[PDB]
Amino acid sequence: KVQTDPPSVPICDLYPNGVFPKGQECEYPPTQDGRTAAWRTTSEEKKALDQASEEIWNDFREAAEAHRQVRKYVMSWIKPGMTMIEICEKLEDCSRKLIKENGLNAGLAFPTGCSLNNCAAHYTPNAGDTTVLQYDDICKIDFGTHISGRIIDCAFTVTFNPKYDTLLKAVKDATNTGIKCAGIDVRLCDVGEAIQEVMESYEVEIDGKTYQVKPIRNLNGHSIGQYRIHAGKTVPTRMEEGEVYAIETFGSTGKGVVHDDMECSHYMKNFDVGHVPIRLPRTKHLLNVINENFGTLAFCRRWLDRLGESKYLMALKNLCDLGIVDPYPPLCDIKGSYTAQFEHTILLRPTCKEVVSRGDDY
Ligand SMILES: COc1ccccc1C(=O)OC[C@H]1CCCN1c1ccnc2ncnn12
Ligand SMILES: [Mn+2]
Ligand SMILES: [Mn+2]
Question: Per UniProt, where does a divalent metal cation 2 bind?
Fold first, then answer.
């Protein structure tokens, strides 16, 4: 069983024994005293703890392999001239096939971000959006897969004009620095400081203007929990054994701060909201659809459309106003600025740090 071109075979079918490829495995950084953490690799008790969660890591690995195969495919065809809707639908069709989508047990972890230019995150087109990808666009492809709610959050930036090359390099270096710095017992603030230092060491020139690259200070890496993209720890307290993090950085030629802008596409149930009885029929129906199809995973309007829902906007506003669902509008820096992103998911296993979403690409 080999993968097709275009990819269509589920990752599950490529690996008969149910054992999926490990990501990049790394020794933890030396502790603050200077002594190595390499003892974790060979510790019999850490090995036992690690093995006790093998099922879980194996789920992340399956999801990461889908992510690698999907994004390699995307990079082969994404071109100016395509509509943003076309791009998102072609990506998502492939992701559903490779993840072997099955209700809440396997599927897409959150909508395909394809944020453009000064917009850094949380843009995906709604129905009727006529936006076309341009030669000069800088596009952040941020998409997620999951198996049993074990989420891969992983993202890269697409460009066609070499003028952004050094901006991309800066952000990639900053993200890799964050990944290198991460570790059990490492303070979240120290990971953030390392990211900032690296990113600010780059100066770039774009259309005759020079900039020192700025990290976006209100767009942070975060812990990841089961069915919970943001589990409550942010990378601006310590990282702990067994936690999972998205290490991400955003570089900007703008102010280095984002604000809500444009039409909202992304929504997600508040993880901490329980059962709320609703009588209003369209609102009740929409909540049921959300509970059945997404649970606490993020969704977008296009995903409601594809389920055959219509006339739901007022119902969706009602759920937002009730605090049951939260809106996540696009987050953008100033007009005319450029933003770039790279992101990986890392597992803080008892024995080592695994960049589970690492590929040959980034
Ligand atoms: C501090 O911001 C938060 C605090 C609590 C809960 C959620 C968020 C929050 O911003 O959640 C945003 C999620 C929901 C919509 C899509 N989105 C995505 C998409 C792609 N990659 C992502 N990495 C992290 N989130 N995220
Ligand atoms: Mn992401
Ligand atoms: Mn993230």
Answer: 153, 222, 248, 343
- Which tokens is 280 given? 């209003």
CA-nearest of 139, 145, 111, 138 to 125 is 111
- Residue 99, class by beta-carbon neighbours within 10 Å (0-12 exposed, 13-18 middle, 19+ buried)? buried
**Whole-angstrom distance, CA of residue 345 vs CA of residue 355:** 6
For residue 142, indicate whether it is catalytic. yes
Q: Are 265 and 126 in contact (CB under 8 A)?
A: yes
Contact 299, 293 (CB under 8 A): yes
In this structure, are residues 344 and 357 in contact, taking their beta carbons and an 8 Å threshold? Answer: yes
Resolution value (Å, 1 decimal): 1.8
Q: Are strands 353-355 and 24-26 parallel, antiparallel or unpaired?
A: antiparallel
Which domains, ranges and CATH numbers included, belong to the chain? 55-255+335-358 (3.90.230.10), 256-334 (1.10.10.10)
Query: Cα 94 to chain center, whole Å?
Result: 17
| Residue of minimum CA distance from atom 9 in ligand 1 | 230
Rg (CA), the chain: 20
Name the method of structure determination. Answer: X-ray
Ligand 1, atom 4, lies closest to the CA of: 230
194's tokens: 């390392």
Helices (H), 200-280: none
Distance CA 56, CA 131 (A): 39
Ligand 1 centre distance from Cα of residue 333 (Å):
17
Q: Are 223 and 348 in contact (CB under 8 A)?
A: no
**Which CA distances in Å does 1 have to 9, 11, 14, 15, 164?**
9, 10, 6, 8, 40
Residues 6 or more apart whose CB falls under 8 angstroms from that of 35 comprise: none
**DSSP assignment of 172-212, as one string?**
HHHHHHHHHH--TT-BHHHHHHHHHHHHTT-EEEETTEEEE
Of 50, 62, 137, 248, the catalytic one is: 248
